[PDB]
Every structure is written in C-alpha cells, then in structure tokens.
Amino acid sequence: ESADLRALAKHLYDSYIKSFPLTKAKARAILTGKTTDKSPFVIYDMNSLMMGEDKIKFKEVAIRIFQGCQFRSVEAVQEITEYAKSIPGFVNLDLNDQVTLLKYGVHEIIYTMLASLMNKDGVLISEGQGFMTREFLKSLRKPFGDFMEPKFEFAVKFNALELDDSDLAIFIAVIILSGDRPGLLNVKPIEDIQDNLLQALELQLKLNHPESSQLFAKLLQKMTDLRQIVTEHVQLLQVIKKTETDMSLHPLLQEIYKD
Amino acid sequence: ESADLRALAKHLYDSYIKSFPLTKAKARAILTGKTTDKSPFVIYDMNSLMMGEDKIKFEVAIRIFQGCQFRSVEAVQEITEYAKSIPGFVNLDLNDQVTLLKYGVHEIIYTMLASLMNKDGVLISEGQGFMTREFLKSLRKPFGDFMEPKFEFAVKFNALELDDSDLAIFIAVIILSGDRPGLLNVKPIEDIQDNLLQALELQLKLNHPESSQLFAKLLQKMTDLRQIVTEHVQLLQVIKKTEHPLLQEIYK
Numbered sequence: 001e002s003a004d005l006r007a008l009a010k011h012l013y014d015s016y017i018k019s020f021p022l023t024k025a026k027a028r029a030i031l032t033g034k035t036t037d038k039s040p041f042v043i044y045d046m047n048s049l050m051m052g053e054d055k056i057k058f059k060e061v062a063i064r065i066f067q068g069c070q071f072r073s074v075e076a077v078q079e080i081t082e083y084a085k086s087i088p089g090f091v092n093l094d095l096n097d098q099v100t101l102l103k104y105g106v107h108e109i110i111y112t113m114l115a116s117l118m119n120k121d122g123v124l125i126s127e128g129q130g131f132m133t134r135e136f137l138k139s140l141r142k143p144f145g146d147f148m149e150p151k152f153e154f155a156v157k158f159n160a161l162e163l164d165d166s167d168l169a170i171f172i173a174v175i176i177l178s179g180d181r182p183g184l185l186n187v188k189p190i191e192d193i194q195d196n197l198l199q200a201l202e203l204q205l206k207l208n209h210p211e212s213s214q215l216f217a218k219l220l221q222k223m224t225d226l227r228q229i230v231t232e233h234v235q236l237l238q239v240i241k242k243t244e245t246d247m248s249l250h251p252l253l254q255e256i257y258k259d
Numbered sequence: 260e261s262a263d264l265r266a267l268a269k270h271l272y273d274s275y276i277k278s279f280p281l282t283k284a285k286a287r288a289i290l291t292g293k294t295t296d297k298s299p300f301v302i303y304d305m306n307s308l309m310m311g312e313d314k315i316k317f318e319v320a321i322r323i324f325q326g327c328q329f330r331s332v333e334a335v336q337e338i339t340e341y342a343k344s345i346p347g348f349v350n351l352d353l354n355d356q357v358t359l360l361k362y363g364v365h366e367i368i369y370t371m372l373a374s375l376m377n378k379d380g381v382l383i384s385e386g387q388g389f390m391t392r393e394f395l396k397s398l399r400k401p402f403g404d405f406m407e408p409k410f411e412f413a414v415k416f417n418a419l420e421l422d423d424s425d426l427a428i429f430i431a432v433i434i435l436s437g438d439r440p441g442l443l444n445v446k447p448i449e450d451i452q453d454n455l456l457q458a459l460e461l462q463l464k465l466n467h468p469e470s471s472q473l474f475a476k477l478l479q480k481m482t483d484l485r486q487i488v489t490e491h492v493q494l495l496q497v498i499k500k501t502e503h504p505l506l507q508e509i510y511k
C-alpha cells in the first residue's frame with residue numbers, strides 16, 4: 001500500500017533530522033546567502049587558515065587539516081550509527097551483520113552527505129562556520145593535494161540530481177541495508193528490508209520530483225560512483241600511513257578500514 | 260468527557276499490541292504453564308546455558324549482560340514506534356521528542372521487564388527461554404547483583420495486577436513527563452500527560468473497581484522506577500571499569 005511506504009518515509013526523515021545537525025537544507029542556505037543563516041568565514045590560504053582558529057571554532061598545515069577532516073569523520077560515523085539504529089529492522093538483525101553493514105556502508109554515506117556541504121568551489125567546514133575552497137585543498141602537499149578532489153567531482157554530479165533531505169534519508173537507508181557486503185551471515189533479511197526501502201524511495205522520488213524522469217534509476221546508478229571513490233580513498237590512506245608513520249588514525253576509523 | 264478517555268484508552272492499547280510483540284497476557288501464559296502448547300527452555304546453571312545458544316539462537320557473565328543490552332536497543336525501537344502513536348507526541352518540538360525518549364526509555368524498559376518476570380526468574384528471547392533468578396544471582400561481582408534489584412521491583416509491581424490495556428496508558432504517562440532535563444516547551448507535554456492521567460485514572464477504576472486507590476499506588480511506583488534507573492546507570496559506571504569499536508558505538 002502507498003500509505004505504509006509514505007509513513008516509512010516520514011519515519012526516516014524524522015530520524016535523519018534528529019541524527020544529523022547539519023542538513024543539506026541548512027547547508028544550502030549558508031552557501032547561497034539567505035538570511036535564515038549567517039555567513040561563513042572563507043578559508044582559502046595559509047593566511048586565512050590562521051584567522052580561522054581565531055574566528056571559527058576548531059605539525060604540517062596539510063596534515064593538521066587531515067587530522068581535522070579525520071576527526072570530523074568519526075563524528076559523522078557516530079551520527080550515521082545513530083541513524084541506522086532507527087531503521088526498522090536493523091537492530092533486530094544479527095549483530096555481526098549490523099557491524100558489517102556499518103563498517104562498509106559508512107563511507108558511502110559520508111561522501112553522500114559531504115556533497116550537501118559542497119558546491120563547485122569548496123566545502124563548508126565546522127558545522128557550517130567555515131568554508132574551505134576547492135583550490136586551497138588541491139594546492140596542498142603532494143599526498144594531500146588529491147584527497148578531496150574526487151569527492152568534489154562526485155558532489156557536483158550528485159548535487160545535480162537536486163535531492164532534498166527527505167529523499168536523502170531514504171537513500172541513506174538503502175545504502176546501509178545493502179546485502180552484498182563481504183562477510184554478511186544472513187543476507188536475506190537485509191535484502192527484505194532493502195526491498196522495502198527501495199519501494200519507499202521509488203514512490204518518494206516520484207512524488208517529491210514528479211517531473212524528474214527516471215530519478216530513481218539515476219539515483220541508484222550513482223551507487224557506482226560512491227563505490228569507486230571509497231576505493232581511491234582507502235588506497236590513498238595507506239600511502240600516508242607510511243609517508244608519515246608519525247601520524248595516527250583514531251581507533252574507530254581504524255576498525256572501519258579492513259584491507 | 261469520558262467517551263474520549265475510553266477512546267484514547269483503546270487507541271493506545273491497539274497501538275501497544277502493534278508495537279510490542281510479547282505482551283503481558285502472552286508472557287503470563289508462558290510463566291504459569293497455562294498454555295502448554297509451547298514450553299520454554301530453562302537456564303538454571305552453567306551447562307543449561309551453553310546448551311541454550313543451540314536451542315534459542317542468539318566469559319559467561321559478560322556475554323550475558325551484553326545480550327541484555329542488545330535487547331534494550333531492540334526494545335527502545337519498539338518504544339519509539341509506540342510513542343509516535345500518542346496523540347500529539349509527533350506535534351511537539353523534535354528536540355522535546357528526543358529528550359522525552361532519551362530519559363523515558365529506561366523507566367519503560369524495567370516496567371515491561373516486569374511483565375516478563377516472576378519470583379523465580381525472567382523470560383528471555385521472545386519468551387522461548389526462562390533464566391532463573393537463582394542462576395543470575397550466582398554470577399560474578401558486579402554481575403551477580405545486576406538483575407537482583409529489578410526482580411525485587413517486579414514482584415512488588417506485578418502485585419498490582421495490571422494488564423496490557425493498563426500498562427498501555429501507564430507507560431504513555433511515563434513518556435510525557437514534563438520534568439526531563441533540557442525540555443524547551445513543557446506546556447504541550449504536561450498538556451498530554453494530564454490527558455493520559457485522566458484516561459489512566461478512569462481505566463484503573465473500570466478495570467479494577469475492587470482495587471482501592473490503585474491510581475495512587477501506580478503513581479507511587481514511579482518513584483521506585485526512577486530510583487531503579489539511577490541505581491542502574493552507575494552500575495554501568497562500575498562495569499565501564501571491568502570490560503567492535505563499532506559495537507561500542509551502537510551501544511551508547
């Protein structure tokens with residue numbers, strides 16, 4: 001029945017609101033100039049980089065950003081995990097599976113919501129207080145100049161679909177409850193929920209975006225882009241783990257990463 | 260007007276059946292042997308336990324309370340789904356919704372843990388098990404005292420013979436407690452609790468006419484509930500001193 005799906009859309013939107021303080025809609029207000037939010041201090045060079053500790057709340061310059069990006073990730077992990085817990089069925093699954101959905105589905109979800117924070121020119125940082133240009137990032141040191149660039153490439157392809165937060169919440173769920181991830185014990189109950197999530201999404205996109213022909217297919221097809229950018233990341237991470245054996249990864253991120 | 264409260268009373272009860280798979284009527288049948296159709300595997304000492312993972316699919320004392328937490332999390336989800344059926348619950352400020360559940364869940368979980376409990380132990384795994392109280396008292400410290408206070412409370416609580424139709428309005432009242440720290444807009448909250456309480460007060464009289472001042476005795480147990488949770492949280496404090504990083508994060 002329609003009504004059962006649209007009621008599941010409501011439920012997940014609501015959890016998404018309750019688990020993610022910087023929504024895409026908050027993000028876009030800041031990035032355009034609406035008077036519902038005030039303005040970001042742009043960081044675009046080492047000079048601005050250094051009023052940045054003064055103005056907005058917050059060792060090589062390139063690495064200090066990394067360990068900042070890395071701390072943001074763990075907060076984002078902490079946040080997606082809370083959102084999964086609301087996904088009907090998820091907590092009832094086997095527990096070894098729950099950790100395997102999270103461990104693999106987390107990064108794909110990061111880079112999806114990181115797109116809400118990005119436009120062609122840069123990325124909000126610090127709960128929106130900051131904004132860091134794409135040009136600054138790509139100009140950093142020879143391992144680090146290439147970390148956020150393919151994130152940007154995806155985000156501009158992705159943001160063109162013009163999803164709002166309420167669509168995103170359902171698409172986030174499908175991502176989590178995949179069923180094709182390595183090491184799952186009972187894929188069938190997973191697949192059964194994801195079938196329900198896909199149904200919900202399918203309806204939701206047709207209702208929210210009635211002129212957007214085949215947005216469902218175009219949405220789901222972007223699950224390929226995400227996969228590939230997780231792959232470049234992991235590989236790129238292991239380079240600096242031995243360029244700077246000085247630098248440390250936080251334990252929960254450590255667990256996520258199982259080469 | 261009493262029609263609305265009788266109407267609220269069944270709207271909640273129906274929502275409670277949809278939200279909670281294992282009801283007190285259901286449990287009660289299993290405990291008393293009345294419904295002989297199925298009989299729960301019982302875990303009375305060590306060797307019954309290791310045998311129990313085979314029958315009911317899921318150190319020893321650690322694995323036990325660890326499984327005790329997995330079900331809390333499941334239960335929280337069933338509570339949350341129920342909450343959203345309470346008239347006007349979803350109409351409140353999303354922050355106030357999160358705060359009512361943040362502080363309300365534990366009180367509700369021991370309440371419905373009481374439906375699962377008699378003098379001698381507690382039903383486990385959707386009732387397909389029964390773990391003896393004496394087996395859980397034999398656990399290592401601090402684990403041998405964990406469920407002992409809860410057992411104490413359930414016997415007193417189960418002594419007010421409440422049914423699921425009662426508990427349905429009761430626990431609603433727990434959730435609309437306007438004194439949870441950090442609320443932003445309390446009027447609507449207290450506005451719903453004063454409605455739940457009217458409906459609970461009527462429900463107690465009609466369902467328990469011979470039970471004198473039961474309303475009052477129910478409201479007094481909410482002292483024993485709050486005291487229980489306080490007592491619970493800081494034993495999880497001293498278990499943070501005795502014992503995947505992904506797992507710790509699912510369990511907050």
Ligand SMILES: O=C(O)c1c(Sc2ccccc2)c2cc(Cl)ccc2n1Cc1ccc(Cl)cc1
Pocket residue numbers: 322323324325326327329330331334368372375381382383384385386395406
């Ligand atoms: O998942 C279960 O059914 C369960 C469990 S899980 C378990 C089963 C066997 C050995 C260790 C843990 C449980 C454990 C204890 Cl010490 C007390 C009550 C327990 N239960 C029953 C329970 C039901 C509901 C809620 Cl809210 C919390 C607990």
